[PDB]
């Protein structure tokens, strides 16, 4: 039987979170790049502002990913419990 083996691993709201956060990663990556590499004169207040927005977007995508890993393990928990019924007779 399955002995000690377990299910092998690996939403609308979460998806919405993703497109908006990912667009802002693009936005802020571009604006940091522009303001640090494409200007004659670096405006540090501007860079700070876009660094805050950049980290917020990146960390939002991390949060989504972590939640999907959590959801996936919850689903695998349900499947593992179901699979205990495969142990017969």
């Amino acid at each position: 039987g399955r002995k000690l083996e377990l299910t092998k691993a690996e939403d609308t709201q979460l998806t919405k979170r993703v497109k908006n956060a990912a667009a802002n990663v693009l936005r802020e990556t571009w604006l940091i790049y522009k303001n640090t590499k494409l200007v004659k004169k670096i405006d540090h207040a501007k860079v700070r502002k876009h660094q805050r927005k950049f980290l917020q977007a990146i960390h939002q995508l991390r949060s989504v990913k972590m939640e999907q890993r959590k959801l996936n393990d919850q689903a695998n928990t349900l499947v593992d419990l179901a699979k205990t019924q495969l142990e017969h007779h």
Binding site: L6, K8, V79, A82, K83, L86
Partner: protein
Amino acid sequence: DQLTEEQIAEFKEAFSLFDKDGDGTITTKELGTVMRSLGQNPTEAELQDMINEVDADGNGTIDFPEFLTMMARKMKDTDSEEEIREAFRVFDKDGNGYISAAELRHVMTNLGEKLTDEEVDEMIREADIDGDGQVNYEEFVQMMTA
């Protein structure tokens, strides 16, 4: 993503583990109860998401054929050697790859659901390969998962 006859039957028994009132459907409420009985704590939104992933007709609950699809997509299993070794590591106080027979008894007779001092005797008889009063838990786990 294909299932046999006897497995479809055994999964019907499984469905009853979830469908507590036997009304033919699993609700978020029933899923919450089961998940908590396993020592997890899914939020409302997480319960709804688990139902939604396999809720093919969008009626908000899981029926038996939906339940079989969740299964068919994840029949694949994998060995648990590393995760089991990590669980033993928790008790490896000095990080040296060993847990003494004395310390194993102390863990197993006090923590979690527990083993009796006698069940502990059978476990240590198997685990202490060298008869040195020490358990190389990497090796013991490899033996049990071979």
